[PDB]
Amino acid sequence: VPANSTSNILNRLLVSYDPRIRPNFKGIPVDVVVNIFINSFGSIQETTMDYRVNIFLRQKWNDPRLKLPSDFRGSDALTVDPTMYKCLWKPDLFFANEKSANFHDVTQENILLFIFRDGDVLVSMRLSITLSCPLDLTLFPMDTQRCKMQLESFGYTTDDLRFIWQSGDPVQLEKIALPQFDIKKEDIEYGNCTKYYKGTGYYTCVEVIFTLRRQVGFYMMGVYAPTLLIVVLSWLSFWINPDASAARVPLGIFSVLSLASECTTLAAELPKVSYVKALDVWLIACLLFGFASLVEYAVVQVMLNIPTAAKRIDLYARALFPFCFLFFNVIYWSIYL
Amino acid sequence: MSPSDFLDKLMGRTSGYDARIRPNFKGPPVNVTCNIFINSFGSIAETTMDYRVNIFLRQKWNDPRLAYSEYPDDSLDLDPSMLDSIWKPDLFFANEKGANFHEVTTDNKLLRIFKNGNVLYSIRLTLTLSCPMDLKNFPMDVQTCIMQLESFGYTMNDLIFEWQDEAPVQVAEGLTLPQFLLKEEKDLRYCTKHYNTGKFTCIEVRFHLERQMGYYLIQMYIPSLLIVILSWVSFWINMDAAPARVALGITTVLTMTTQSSGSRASLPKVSYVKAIDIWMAVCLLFVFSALLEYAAVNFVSRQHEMRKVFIDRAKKIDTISRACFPLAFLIFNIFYWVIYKILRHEDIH
Amino acid sequence: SPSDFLDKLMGRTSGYDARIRPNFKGPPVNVTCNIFINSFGSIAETTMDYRVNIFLRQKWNDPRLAYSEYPDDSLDLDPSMLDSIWKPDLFFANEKGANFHEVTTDNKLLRIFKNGNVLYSIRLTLTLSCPMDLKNFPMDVQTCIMQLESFGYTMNDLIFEWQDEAPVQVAEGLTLPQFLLKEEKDLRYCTKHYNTGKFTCIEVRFHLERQMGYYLIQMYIPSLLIVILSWVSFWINMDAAPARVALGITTVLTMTTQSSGSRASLPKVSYVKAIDIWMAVCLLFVFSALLEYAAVNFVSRQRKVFIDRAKKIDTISRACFPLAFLIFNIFYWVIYKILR
Amino acid sequence: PMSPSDFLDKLMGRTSGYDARIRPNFKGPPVNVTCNIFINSFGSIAETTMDYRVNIFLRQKWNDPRLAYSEYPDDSLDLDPSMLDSIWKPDLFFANEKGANFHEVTTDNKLLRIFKNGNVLYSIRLTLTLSCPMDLKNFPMDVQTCIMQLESFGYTMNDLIFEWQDEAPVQVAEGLTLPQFLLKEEKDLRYCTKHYNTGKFTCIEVRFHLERQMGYYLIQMYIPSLLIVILSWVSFWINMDAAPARVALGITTVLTMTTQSSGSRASLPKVSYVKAIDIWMAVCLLFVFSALLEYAAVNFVSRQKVFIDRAKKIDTISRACFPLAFLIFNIFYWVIYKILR
Amino acid sequence: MSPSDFLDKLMGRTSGYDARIRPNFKGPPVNVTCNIFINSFGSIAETTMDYRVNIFLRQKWNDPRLAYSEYPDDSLDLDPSMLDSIWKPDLFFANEKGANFHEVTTDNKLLRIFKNGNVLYSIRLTLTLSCPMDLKNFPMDVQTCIMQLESFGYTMNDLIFEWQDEAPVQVAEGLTLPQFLLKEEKDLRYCTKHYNTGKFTCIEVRFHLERQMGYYLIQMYIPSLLIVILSWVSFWINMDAAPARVALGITTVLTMTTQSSGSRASLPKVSYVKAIDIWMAVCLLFVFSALLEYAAVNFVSRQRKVFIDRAKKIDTISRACFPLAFLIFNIFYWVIYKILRHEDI
Numbered sequence A: 001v002p003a004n005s006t007s008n009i010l011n012r013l014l015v016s017y018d019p020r021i022r023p024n025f026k027g028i029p030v031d032v033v034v035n036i037f038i039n040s041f042g043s044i045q046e047t048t049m050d051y052r053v054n055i056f057l058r059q060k061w062n063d064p065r066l067k068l069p070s071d072f073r074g075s076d077a078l079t080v081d082p083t084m085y086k087c088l089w090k091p092d093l094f095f096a097n098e099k100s101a102n103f104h105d106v107t108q109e110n111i112l113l114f115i116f117r118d119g120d121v122l123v124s125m126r127l128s129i130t131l132s133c134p135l136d137l138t139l140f141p142m143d144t145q146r147c148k149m150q151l152e153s154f155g156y157t158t159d160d161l162r163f164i165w166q167s168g169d170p171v172q173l174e175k176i177a178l179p180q181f182d183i184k185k186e187d188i189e190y191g192n193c194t195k196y197y198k199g200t201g202y203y204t205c206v207e208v209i210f211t212l213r214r215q216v217g218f219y220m221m222g223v224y225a226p227t228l229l230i231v232v233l234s235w236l237s238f239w240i241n242p243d244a245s246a247a248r249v250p251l252g253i254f255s256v257l258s259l260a261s262e263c264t265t266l267a268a269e270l271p272k273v274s275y276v277k278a279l280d281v282w283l284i285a286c287l288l289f290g291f292a293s294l295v296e297y298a299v300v301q302v303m304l305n306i307p308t309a310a311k312r313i314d315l316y317a318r319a320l321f322p323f324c325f326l327f328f329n330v331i332y333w334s335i336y337l
Numbered sequence B: 001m002s003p004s005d006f007l008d009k010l011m012g013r014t015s016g017y018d019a020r021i022r023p024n025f026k027g028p029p030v031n032v033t034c035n036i037f038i039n040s041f042g043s044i045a046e047t048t049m050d051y052r053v054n055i056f057l058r059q060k061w062n063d064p065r066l067a068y069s070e071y072p073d074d075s076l077d078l079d080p081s082m083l084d085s086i087w088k089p090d091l092f093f094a095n096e097k098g099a100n101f102h103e104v105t106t107d108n109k110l111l112r113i114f115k116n117g118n119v120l121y122s123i124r125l126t127l128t129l130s131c132p133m134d135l136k137n138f139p140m141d142v143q144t145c146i147m148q149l150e151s152f153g154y155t156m157n158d159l160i161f162e163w164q165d166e167a168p169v170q171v172a173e174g175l176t177l178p179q180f181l182l183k184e185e186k187d188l189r190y191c192t193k194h195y196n197t198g199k200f201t202c203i204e205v206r207f208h209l210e211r212q213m214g215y216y217l218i219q220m221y222i223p224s225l226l227i228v229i230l231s232w233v234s235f236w237i238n239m240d241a242a243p244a245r246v247a248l249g250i251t252t253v254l255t256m257t258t259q260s261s262g263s264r265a266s267l268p269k270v271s272y273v274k275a276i277d278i279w280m281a282v283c284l285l286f287v288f289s290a291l292l293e294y295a296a297v298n299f300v301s302r303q304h305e306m307r308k309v310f311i312d313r314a315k316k317i318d319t320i321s322r323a324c325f326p327l328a329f330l331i332f333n334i335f336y337w338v339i340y341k342i343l344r345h346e347d348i349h
Numbered sequence C: 001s002p003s004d005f006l007d008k009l010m011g012r013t014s015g016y017d018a019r020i021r022p023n024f025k026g027p028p029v030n031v032t033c034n035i036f037i038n039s040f041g042s043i044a045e046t047t048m049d050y051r052v053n054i055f056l057r058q059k060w061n062d063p064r065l066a067y068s069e070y071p072d073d074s075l076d077l078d079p080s081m082l083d084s085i086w087k088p089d090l091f092f093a094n095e096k097g098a099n100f101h102e103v104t105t106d107n108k109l110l111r112i113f114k115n116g117n118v119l120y121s122i123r124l125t126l127t128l129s130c131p132m133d134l135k136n137f138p139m140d141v142q143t144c145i146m147q148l149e150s151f152g153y154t155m156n157d158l159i160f161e162w163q164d165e166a167p168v169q170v171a172e173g174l175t176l177p178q179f180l181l182k183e184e185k186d187l188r189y190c191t192k193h194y195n196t197g198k199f200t201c202i203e204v205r206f207h208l209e210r211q212m213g214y215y216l217i218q219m220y221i222p223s224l225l226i227v228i229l230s231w232v233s234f235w236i237n238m239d240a241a242p243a244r245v246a247l248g249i250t251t252v253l254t255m256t257t258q259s260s261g262s263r264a265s266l267p268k269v270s271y272v273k274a275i276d277i278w279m280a281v282c283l284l285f286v287f288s289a290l291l292e293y294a295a296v297n298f299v300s301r302q303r304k305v306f307i308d309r310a311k312k313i314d315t316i317s318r319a320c321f322p323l324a325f326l327i328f329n330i331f332y333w334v335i336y337k338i339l340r
Numbered sequence D: 001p002m003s004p005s006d007f008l009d010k011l012m013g014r015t016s017g018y019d020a021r022i023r024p025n026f027k028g029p030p031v032n033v034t035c036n037i038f039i040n041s042f043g044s045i046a047e048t049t050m051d052y053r054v055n056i057f058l059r060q061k062w063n064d065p066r067l068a069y070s071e072y073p074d075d076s077l078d079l080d081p082s083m084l085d086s087i088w089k090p091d092l093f094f095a096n097e098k099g100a101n102f103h104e105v106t107t108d109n110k111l112l113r114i115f116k117n118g119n120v121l122y123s124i125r126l127t128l129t130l131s132c133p134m135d136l137k138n139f140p141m142d143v144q145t146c147i148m149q150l151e152s153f154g155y156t157m158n159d160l161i162f163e164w165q166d167e168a169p170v171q172v173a174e175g176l177t178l179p180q181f182l183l184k185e186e187k188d189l190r191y192c193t194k195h196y197n198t199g200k201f202t203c204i205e206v207r208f209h210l211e212r213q214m215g216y217y218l219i220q221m222y223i224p225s226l227l228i229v230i231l232s233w234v235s236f237w238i239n240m241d242a243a244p245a246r247v248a249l250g251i252t253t254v255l256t257m258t259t260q261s262s263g264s265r266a267s268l269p270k271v272s273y274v275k276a277i278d279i280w281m282a283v284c285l286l287f288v289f290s291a292l293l294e295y296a297a298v299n300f301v302s303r304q305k306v307f308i309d310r311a312k313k314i315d316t317i318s319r320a321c322f323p324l325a326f327l328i329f330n331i332f333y334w335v336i337y338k339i340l341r
Numbered sequence E: 001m002s003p004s005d006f007l008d009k010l011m012g013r014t015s016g017y018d019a020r021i022r023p024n025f026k027g028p029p030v031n032v033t034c035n036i037f038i039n040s041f042g043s044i045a046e047t048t049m050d051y052r053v054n055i056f057l058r059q060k061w062n063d064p065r066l067a068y069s070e071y072p073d074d075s076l077d078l079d080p081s082m083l084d085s086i087w088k089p090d091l092f093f094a095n096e097k098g099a100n101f102h103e104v105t106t107d108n109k110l111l112r113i114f115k116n117g118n119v120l121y122s123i124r125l126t127l128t129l130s131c132p133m134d135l136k137n138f139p140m141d142v143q144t145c146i147m148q149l150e151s152f153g154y155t156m157n158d159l160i161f162e163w164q165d166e167a168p169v170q171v172a173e174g175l176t177l178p179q180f181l182l183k184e185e186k187d188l189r190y191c192t193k194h195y196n197t198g199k200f201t202c203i204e205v206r207f208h209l210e211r212q213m214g215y216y217l218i219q220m221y222i223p224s225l226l227i228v229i230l231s232w233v234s235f236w237i238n239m240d241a242a243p244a245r246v247a248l249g250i251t252t253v254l255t256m257t258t259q260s261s262g263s264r265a266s267l268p269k270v271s272y273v274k275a276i277d278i279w280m281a282v283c284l285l286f287v288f289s290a291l292l293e294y295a296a297v298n299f300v301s302r303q304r305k306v307f308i309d310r311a312k313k314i315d316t317i318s319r320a321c322f323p324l325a326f327l328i329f330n331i332f333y334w335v336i337y338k339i340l341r342h343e344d345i
Ligand SMILES: *[C@@H]1O[C@H](CO)[C@@H](O)[C@H](O)[C@H]1NC(C)=O
Pocket: A163, A164, A165, A191, A192, A193, A194, A206
């Protein structure tokens, strides 16, 4: 029998096959096994509260109408041209937590359609989906984002279509590096949600939850160090002789202006949320320290109009500012470790 | 008998059903009941005046040509591929700027046929709807963005839209917003737009959005609040220290110009004035007046027993200012924050 | 049967050919088009374009679509059946990009009258291009252009023209975020000419006038207040040299920064615009205040009878500068009132 | 008696037997295609991504003996644009392009015309963001020559040959203007005839000589930098005894122009060489830095006699030298970059 | 005889040729020799970790079903629309973010059929490929990007890719990059990805890129050097001017902090310290040490007592110790990143 004849008698308009009818019509729901193969990850834009992945979604199910005749026994599997993915039945599937997704088409469709002897069919597509995950920004430097990906079914209810994860190693990924986060392969915990939409019925949904732990290295080297230098400059302003009365205002005022610019820039860089953030706490603490330096200088200048009192105030303040700041910084780090 | 033959006999090629003719042709208009299911929300961009949704738009109608009796089952689900081969009611969103379907591993569509002839039709969508906003009091505003369903092909003489009796607009549990909070109340109206070609059915749903000042307070008001503290801490500096006082004024005014620019950078340009501009302008006028008061005092200490004794008068001026400016600012703070929140504004609720 | 009626009228059995215009090799078919603006806005000068959302409608008469089976004259047909009838070519010449609107169906309307007249209305979204003159930036009046034009057929076979009454409608409550759209809209024949032949073309003009509100609040007012601040030096005691040089310095700096920020939001144009003159002259005033301070400081350092001269120069300038600023400001508004 | 539909089926239709999959004069002389364009819109030249956008009414003409008819007395017969898919077309692609798309509004913006002898006119509206490298050695007064290349892709030179039209091949729409440049009336036309491993391919090239007006830049950063440097000179007349005034003058005049240079470079692409605006700004920065340095030297001299007289002497020397140095530098810089190089 | 009938007899409906089945079914795998011709290269942005190419991808595979003898000529050119009626090899780029075809007045595809059955298929694409970056020494880096060709529909048991032996990768004459220098040696290796479903063929081509200092040396390094010289020039001002000298130290830290914020603005967020980052951070210590020295000098002078002599001594000691420190440290930083500890392949 020619391969053309086998394909025609298996799934063609010339054979009694209806792609519009699911296998086991009006009977047992069609069990579907799904496993994902991550390929590309990243571009986690906190501003838009979303991230972009690139996966090889593979789904395999059962279909008694596709049985390879025992006339020929070439192999257990049988590869078929991808263009016949549109000639046989497929399971309705979509990502509920998805914003903008698309196929890929370069020199050919990126689809593989294995067919086994017993009737099981393996199908895999290459997808580039842009999932959105609600980020929590309560503790920005040491946050742990929890971005998930939940599949679903649309046309068929749980009485016809049901999704089951792979028995072993359902999600795979090979040496993916990230610029900001550290995906943990072992921590790939995943359950299922069985979404229930009122007015239509049940709908199966199997989900994957990725655990991401942002590294604070970039922020530590870039943002916190200039704040530390500004604080040290504010401290160094103390030792200046108060007799000048005009060589100590510029240091403090320019330090507070620099802090204002830094907080404005950081607010612009970050998505707009209502709640407070640890980075905002650091910025407001630094600005409050600058304000305290300014008011201490004002108090010293007022007391200068007495020199012994001014010297005592300067010594006491220079003794209490750095140790108090260090205690505050240590407790802040301990709280947000 | 066979399911393939059943589908062919019901509405397939052998059936003779025509998808180019509306049901109940030359008769009563085919009423359509629609109810949506919001799945996501947000990205309300003030600059471009639009917001994005992700709805599971649904529809229901009747047609005697789809009545079946062979299968005792009532709620029969069908492949979305078949869905293009039956008559569907025209529908579009009037106040939209861009929308698209979702095609991932299939078309995200649903088709359901009931025994009595009713048809269910739920299609996933993604709308970048447009809603003009009023920013008279921007930091503490309330917005009413709309989603306006409307027909385009058939007139109201052939198609009528109406909401479901119970739970017309449903919101998926756990939904939140980045900048606002969605009020549970959603008003429903009839818009029934009129054109020069006929009377067109139209259905409008109201969304009430309220803006929380969590970000805006701590990002604009508090820093601008502390800048004016910095502005009046000069009044305790002696007049003698002239450069200190003058520098303390000018840096404070400059930073407030920069902050006003940064604040207005995030909104579309509007001819009318907003709350944030009023606050910024008044609080900046305060530091400007502080610097000018310095100038007046310095002039007084610069020749306005035959002694000048203008030092005492300058000290009196400084003492009066140090007790007036913080007090005046406090009464302004109370008056503004009450007048833009209680009596004549924020009554839109 | 309605299906049989559609088949006999212009269906497969009819024999109607959709590739041949009505009155083939005869008089040109006159097409009357009127539009309906639904949403108008997104007018950006950075890319020099604006976005509309029109319910474009067309009307034409063809003798091959005459029916007598149905007593009713006005018949509505499925939009998906529009591919089987002749449709006049129509492209917007000054378009940077356009797209249909497909949501749950094609957004089209078809209507066939008993006499054979056909109404065809399609929703669109056009990002047209309109050049602008920025001679008077805050008080300009731009006329952005919508141009309808035929492409496939020459003037010998297709002629466009507006309706007799109510050619352009604007939806009630429509407003511009930036400008103030006038009710008056010019309707002129366009009639472009090319080397291939003569192509019909239809023009409608929108008069757009800018509102000075945002600009007056955000860009003129800070400049006026800052140049007022530059005058605070003249009342300071001459003893404080650093105090006066400082305010002059920071005023010059901040006005330069304001100039950069103001021009950061406009397209690069060779000619000077209206706003730049005001800001440049105010910056020149601040610079001249600093220069006059420097001259008075030179005079002070040459009871040498120089205190009288220094104070005379300072006092004379403290009154000459407000007069100069007032007269320039009045003149700058007056010249722009002369232009408009 | 001959219905137009029957004639169309007889000439290009299914009944005709015309095959759209075979080029005219198969196994014969190469098919020549005289093509001419008509620019409708021009502009959006961005240096950061190094490209520009055009809106051309591309036209092509060729001879095909299988489309010869004598039934209709009229010679120039126009057809529905949908008829294009049933007849042969010449392959074409713009080699130096980054993104292309047709224009579909209420129909396809294509025009088909067929003459009596078989000559076919086919004009299609396009929109191209062509890529053209720029030489930014003298950026404020550069002269760029962006290129549009037309080339066959499928058929080789042995089968398809592209030639410009004899007269007036490239036109410009009346009133066409650019916000930053001037489009010259002259437009060079030359061949390129690129070849690869597959074989020789026909090619067509047109040159748009573009020149820049310094109108925007002269008022945006040339004048402000000059005013800032003029500000830096006012320190000379300030008394040498008073330090903070001259210190602030020098410091702020140095500081305010580094941000000017950063802003100027922000809108320009990263380049290895040095641009003219960069040279001007660097020279002004050196001038203001030397203005601060000379004050530092004066302050050193005063603070170690009668050295105050020497401090006044050096201050006067600086005051009489810096304007001369800036004037000679300006007349040197505005001559070579403007006329010579 | 008739060319249309010849095409129909070769691959048309009357031919019986099947496009759904690969050639030599249930036999040896089909060898596909491919080569690419780069047309446009650029848009290598470090922020999005991506770059854009413009290639004339070509492929050459042998099938026996496309053998003809009617036409004496061996090499024949066909209409690009015939490509849908013949079998094609599946080929997708693994390390890509977004790609598209190119159609203008027709598809940009070439089809050539030789007499012996060899087929030459070439299509014009545009790939926004993704390649990892290394920013340990950001201004002096040698960044290599990858272009992977891998089959998807068939395993290696059926489809096998391999480069052409002679002239595998070409570049158009006059090709240049705005900020990089593409090397002339291009490496060819084998990836041969192995998934759980099967073992699939994969061909990889390496690209070598080296960054130049031209933009950075004149926009980034020099302004910081002149800022440090500005903070330097303080030592020569008279020490009695308490607000004057300190102003330079006040302003230098502010402007250099702003410059540092702008320096990393257009760079991706990276944990490791970049070469520009370490250079400017260590330059921050010098401008801050200038203010530290002034603070120490002022404290010494502000408590006859020969303290002015010590103040001038520390002033000249700083003015003589900063030169050696900067001149040695900056040159060490240059040499270590150039040859000693980094770069050099
Ligand atoms: C899905 O969740 C439902 C909850 O009722 C459970 O019965 C079912 O076993 C789950 N299936 C999978 C594959 O997790």
